[PDB]
């Protein structure tokens, strides 16, 4: 119970996006154990579905109060809270597409739920891309790199992403992120990684074009002594 | 008329965008003779003002149609009128940041007048960088490169901007930019340049924030023999 | 004579270099009209032959002097003779492989020949691209930004170039040259263009593998007034 | 005993490189644990002496049979001893300066040592840059992603690195390399990561400069379950 958050919480979702002019809306909620950095998020499209382009892309937009933490690293995410953060995110992929994406970050203590506002944008994925021909299937495990920015007391993310494809190629992508807590932070964190698992899987059906993803996420440190 | 075009229109502008969260939306109109690739235009920004960013990241987000075109090159753009033509683009500057723009043109041949609607994101603009310290003057003269994409009968714009600073340093910029015609061109054109001049003069005053764009440019091959 | 130069002279070349562990060594001559930006060039594997990637990646590695420069801008290249000068670029290709080459330039007045030597190292051609595949024709006509750093009284090359392939393609690099005078100028140029066409015409035989390089190149501001 | 390699090595190291036009050659000599990933190494400049930049570029120049590989992770570069393996490399500075080098690896197995032929280029380190006014310190530690090249039976290397500066920022770089056996490998491992902990430490004096550098590596998979 502390910060507002419990080892078993709720959240609510709402994306709006816009990639190479289609437009889009996601509704979704799910649930996890902020302390165990473990989440099971519920995705449906329901504006613009269904989407022209592979769902995957949007996947790394949906939380890193969801992150395990050991006692040996500050947690600025969770230091931050109930009040919650917001983050940038930019990523370009190897054939020239870039996308942006932007979230709001708030913890609602009365229904022990978290509310995360979504906004995601992309341009110029080619025609013949896996993007764009659907042949994607999940982003392949991570090791993110993340360093404090000290003037400015907020925290910068570097994570080198390949986003799996059916044909068996990578698909490169170059996440650099910007994470703000919407509190004064009392104290900074050093550098650390946090390595992600995040996994889609397809729940679409006649009517819906629906998916889970689960991510687990854990902080540390080098591995070596 | 020529595709419903004339040497003497005016433009109605409507941009809708969030740099770094921070919301706003722009409109504006302007005048410009599209046979000589020349046009003024003038923003308001009616929401969100005033704008925490320097007011030349959006510039080049305000039209093909002002780019004098000569006989021996397909002119793509004024081919696709009146329907109209769409773009998606994206500004990886050198510290981080970028952003992505849209837009869609078309032209009301009754009015004789040029519809523009656009969207605008940006993304890290570092606290201390040139963007949000206000430090930019105007985009230096430069020469986009056309290339065509006959596959899919669109065109690939590839230019290296540099945005002026205030104690007379640059600020670089890259341009990947994709035009698309909204009506099947029936005619492709080989690869050429783009030389543009773009000047901003800000006419702010206590009630809004305002300012003028003038932008000229020219398509042409090699200088060389 | 002006900086020891003539409008019909003779150059020497001897490059160095080593593609992905392949050794080589190349020499060479020619004549050119420095005046006109107009050169000739003759080239001859003497080491390392026959080389197993394309020679098009080499080509821009083969002198400013040929540059024809008007009178409304500085031209830091014939100011620098006879001493001559010297440069370092890096290429960085679409599919992840990079190069770096480096020149010094010096002039023998006497013999009125040019005296060219320069290395040339690459790294990471994927055995199916296109430069291992010998799918490159020649460089396309490009358009390079050139910009002074006053504070060290050097100048910087920005230029996206791209090598046209045998089934219609096209290979993109780009071109980042740091440009320095070996005597301190007493004067510096604003920023300018330099448009460049760049013609390659192998004339290998059973005995050698050889080529001539045709490249033409003007000085040039802004083309709108 | 396997492969060549024993739990008590050392090897041998020759380094010839030029960056910005200044040649240097390096001699040096170390010991280490292939199988416990650990190694020490001992680097004299031998030529150019004193070096104009900062001697923390070149770190990552001198051998992953220095690398602790668990039973469930395949290891391609013992795999490929005693013969040994190449490797190619390149990497671009945040402020535009880029390297490459390439290493032969040999394993004499008479002399039970290692055999380290090094090849280093680069260009364009600002003269202002934390590079060329020798502010950097170290490496900070990371955790590179090596995949598998099926098709042609070699590796890639992706690895984000930071060099750590005295004023206490940080000089982003991108490892991108190519890890080719001298021999036929008979078993491709599936990717995975390699966290690395290089130092560098000044063991420089009126006569010589020197210094030693420990690399400490091992590879794993996610970390998550």
């Known amino acids: 119970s502390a910060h507002g958050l419990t080892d078993d919480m709720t959240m609510h979702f709402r994306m709006e996006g816009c990639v190479d002019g289609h437009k889009f809306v996601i509704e979704g909620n799910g649930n996890g154990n902020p302390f165990k950095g473990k989440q099971f998020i519920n995705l449906c499209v329901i504006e613009g579905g269904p989407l022209p382009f592979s769902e995957d892309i949007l996947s790394a937009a949906?939380?890193?109060?969801?992150?395990?933490?050991?006692?040996g690293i500050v947690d600025y995410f969770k230091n931050s809270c109930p009040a919650g953060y917001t983050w940038h995110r930019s990523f370009r992929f190897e054939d020239g597409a870039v996308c942006i994406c932007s979230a709001d970050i708030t913890?609602?203590?009365?229904?022990?739920?978290?509310?995360?506002?979504?906004?995601f944008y992309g341009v110029?994925?080619?025609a013949d891309?896996?993007?764009?021909?659907?042949?994607?299937?999940?982003?392949?495990?991570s090791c993110e790199?993340?360093?404090?920015?000290?003037?400015?007391?907020?925290?910068?993310?570097?994570?080198?992403?390949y986003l799996l494809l059916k044909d068996g190629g990578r698909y490169r992508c170059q996440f650099d992120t910007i994470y703000k807590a919407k509190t004064e932070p009392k104290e900074m964190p050093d550098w650390h990684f946090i390595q992600h698992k995040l996994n889609r899987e397809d729940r679409?059906?006649?009517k819906n074009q629906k998916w889970q993803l689960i991510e687990h996420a854990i902080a540390s440190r080098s591995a070596l002594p």
Chains 1, 2, 3, 4 share one sequence.
């Open 62 to 71: 949906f939380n890193r109060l969801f992150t395990e933490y050991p006692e």
């Open 107 to 119: 913890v609602n203590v009365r229904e022990n739920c978290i509310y995360h506002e979504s906004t």
């Open 124 to 126: 110029n994925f080619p």
């Open 129 to 141: 891309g896996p993007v764009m021909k659907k042949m994607t299937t999940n982003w392949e495990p």
């Open 145 to 161: 790199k993340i360093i404090p920015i000290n003037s400015q007391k907020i925290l910068k993310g570097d994570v080198s992403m």
């Open 204 to 206: 679409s059906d006649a």
